Symmetry: C3
Subunit: 345 residues, 3 copies
């Protein structure tokens, strides 16, 4: 009895996002998405450590889904008979039934269809939540993604001026808890079930062994650096389903930041580092002003450099010597300089 | 020489709150409260683990005290001779003398009366603070609560519209540090004094063994679930005196959230997860739109599911199929479905 | 080809700040600062524990640099030949080249001159960032400070009223990771190089051994307490380059707080505890209303009392009995009192 145009959306693998319009004059639609659970071993660091992962659509994070305020979202969740455990899905964007968790529990070999109305604008987390201690275990094993619900008029700056992005990326950050053997080496398992008890012991101490973007250390570095151009307005959506994060664009700023991730609230301007609370998504706009390599990190630098949480942007364009310049290149300290006279010696 | 009506308030045990008016046309009063320290063993988890607790009024958290801006708050603190240690009280709502800590130090068998003026609106923490390493130890042993100072006109949305709650609850979150024996079992002690040295060693590593609401794992689940009704505006006050928290209503939102907890600042709207900084109280409004069970958690899910930090709301009313509906119940995956053709396989 | 007045600034050791104007009618200048790297052993706690530190200008934190929006900042970085490692500098206030890190790498015996334009107002972190795992190691060894870029009209309250401070202090908070021997005693090293491998193992677990303000436990207590007077508006700038902090003035409030530290955003009013995200600086105003000792802490009380993160303010003036008063000093509990009748017994 819900009589609205339907539209099928094909999701893509993060950090890219499926095609969508920002501002729209189209009325409300039923937007149809399909997610298939996949349990599999994945590599999570540059030394080749492996991990028994559980994913939506084979990726960590799950794909970003984009709809407009007032749309209805109809999700088919599929749990193929190759999987070993029950799974479900809960959307933080949705209202009732534990975000839909209470309506979507499916055994291997089954599927379910849930519909929810997109009544609140912003970016939101979605994750598996089977019940009890299964909940943290599914989420930290990789079963979490995000949804963005745009206002029909697109983003604005909270002072009645429109904001438009040229480019969008979705960075999902994941905390992982990998057991070690007596000698400190990471342990390997043949199934998720088998990893469980040792993993639980690591989770209980609340300290991750890895903190990764897009599912592995180095995933968004080297040849998979993110691309941009001087002058472009880039939206970066950042989610963390379980633990806090402090995103920082090294060499840049957050021009407009919705750190709690909800478009009904005016963004903050000109931030250096912002804060994603565990269990939420945030979004930041930035207009690149200078070419070159930028590092996008969590600004716990131990986690960024040593546990895996660094992505790269490669930005093409012309350098602006007004903003920054090397006045004098590295040179010998002058013989006639007197730094030994300074207050602190 | 302070000539104002006096009024005695009877406190109640959390998560309930003593009777009060929201908006008031009464002038400033002296509001008189009494707190009695109690040291005692308490059960803190579902396996029956016990802990040497120190409390105000026998509860963790201490009772919520509610007054209006401009009131004077006169607190009698009582330390009965059955207790073993000196205690005091500091209010984050108050100005001077370390929030009153410097005026309220009492040995067992003594009492003291402090008066402070409620000049700043919001929710605030109160806690014991005897001096030095005693401070964290008293607080994490349970000696902390909150006070709410309402504007005389009641809450507003920051755009000049009144906000009124139908129902209020106070959730105090507590981090606990319970020593373990060689074999990993939790240790038991006959006095707070005796637990001290082993507890200090656990505190120094900054990782709690339990994170509980209203003093124990499961305290606000089962038969002590919180009650509400579709349509009701519920205020949830959340405090954490020592460590950060990220509250999340599973299946719901924060309609209006004062995450730093101060009513002079306009609330944020439509949050998924909010953030209580350690050493503070926050407050969130929500109007229930759907019946059923909701879980209120910190959205570090390891802490929520495995360390104790989950409460339940049971909400009566009629389900709204517009907001959310199960279109197709769990069913076998169709033989003629082709999920093996999807981008991620 | 940049034709502007130059002005040399002499930095001073934190928590004090070099002389500057708040509001200015002067046009843009080139502001010239010099920083010299110093590697040396420092004492970091009250038991005399030592640590292989790396600093800018011999202090942890580095000096606060103050300029106005539109100024150009020209920094000479000097790495004397007594040091053992390459170092550089990155400013979060600057745009491009990893905040200048990519232009400032200097070996011992060398110096470099970088110029950046101060286009964004607020307080910002600066830190060494040589590349890879060297980055967290340099920062947590002490190589980080802050810069404040003031609006030309000075601070305002976000509702078009001017804010002026009578007094400014810079509190840099530092997380430290000191290795322990088998018996739990802190280990000593003869060089930074030698401490490295053991320090890395401690950093990987993400739990600091010390959390200190101005470079050591007790640095801003006793005879080095900070000074103020009843009636004065004091600006406290707080930075943390690597880990989150929750500042709290015990006995006071944050009258006006820029917790994300950026002056383009209206401050919050009347906070009890605020939140500095790791990798950022924040600023808070407060007008002292009462004389006496105040403690400025991070409100993780374990860290404040047990790991080193407490400073003192000593405030002169007259006590205001209206705001707070001891109505009845500590006294025996009356024989005819009946506390045994209270709801919680
Ligand atoms: O109190 C009525 C009773 O109805 C139940 C049956 O399980 O379901 C209601 O809520 C569901 C979502 O939780 C809807 O799918 C269903 O249509 C609705 O009738 C119970 O939840 C509830 O106890
Ligand atoms: O500098 C004056 C001197 O007076 C003291 C005496 O202890 O107390 C003042 O402040 C108290 C609260 O801290 C008030 O109770 C008292 O009435 C007031 O005179 C000292 O704190 C201070 O050194
Ligand atoms: O793409 C052009 C090329 O120029 C380089 C040479 O290293 O430098 C540009 O950016 C520098 C700052 O990163 C400026 O100092 C320099 O003036 C500018 O030409 C490369 O970064 C870049 O690949
Ligand atoms: Cu699952
Ligand atoms: Cu969730
Ligand atoms: Cu106490
Ligand atoms: Cu406190
Ligand atoms: Cu360095
Ligand atoms: Cu940085």
């Amino acid at each position: 009895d819900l009589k609205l145009p339907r539209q099928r959306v094909d999701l893509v693998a993060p950090p890219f996002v499926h095609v969508h319009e920002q501002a729209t004059k189209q009325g409300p639609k039923i937007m149809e998405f399909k997610l298939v659970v996949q349990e599999k071993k994945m590599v999570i660091d540059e030394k080749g450590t492996t991990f028994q992962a559980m994913t939506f659509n084979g990726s960590m994070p799950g794909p970003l889904m984009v709809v407009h305020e007032g749309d209805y979202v109809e999700v088919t969740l599929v749990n193929p008979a190759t999987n070993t455990m029950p799974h479900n899905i809960d959307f933080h964007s949705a209202t009732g039934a534990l975000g839909g968790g209470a309506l979507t529990l499916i055994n291997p070999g089954e599927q379910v269809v849930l519909r929810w109305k997109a009544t609140r604008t912003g970016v939101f987390v979605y994750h598996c939540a089977p019940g009890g201690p299964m909940i943290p275990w599914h989420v930290v094993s990789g079963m979490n993604g995000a949804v963005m619900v745009l206002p029909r008029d697109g983003l604005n700056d909270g002072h009645g001026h429109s904001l438009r992005y040229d480019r969008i990326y979705y960075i999902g950050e994941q905390d992982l808890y990998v057991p070690r053997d007596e000698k400190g080496n990471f342990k390997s398992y043949d199934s998720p079930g088998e990893a469980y008890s040792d993993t639980e012991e690591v989770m209980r101490k609340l300290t991750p062994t890895h903190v990764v973007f897009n599912g592995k250390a180095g995933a968004l570095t080297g040849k998979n650096a993110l691309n941009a151009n001087v002058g472009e307005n880039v939206l970066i959506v950042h989610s963390q389903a379980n633990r806090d994060s402090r995103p920082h664009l090294i060499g840049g700023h957050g021009d407009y930041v919705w750190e709690t991730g909800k478009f009904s609230n005016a963004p903050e301007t000109g931030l250096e580092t912002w804060f994603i609370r565990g269990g939420s998504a945030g979004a930041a706009l930035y207009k690149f002003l200078q070419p070159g390599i930028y590092a996008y990190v969590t600004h716990n630098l131990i986690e960024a450099a040593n546990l895996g949480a660094t992505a790269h942007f490669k930005v093409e364009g012309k350098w602006n010597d007004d903003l920054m310049t090397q006045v004098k290149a590295p040179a010998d300290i002058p013989t006639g300089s007197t730094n030994e006279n300074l207050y602190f010696q």
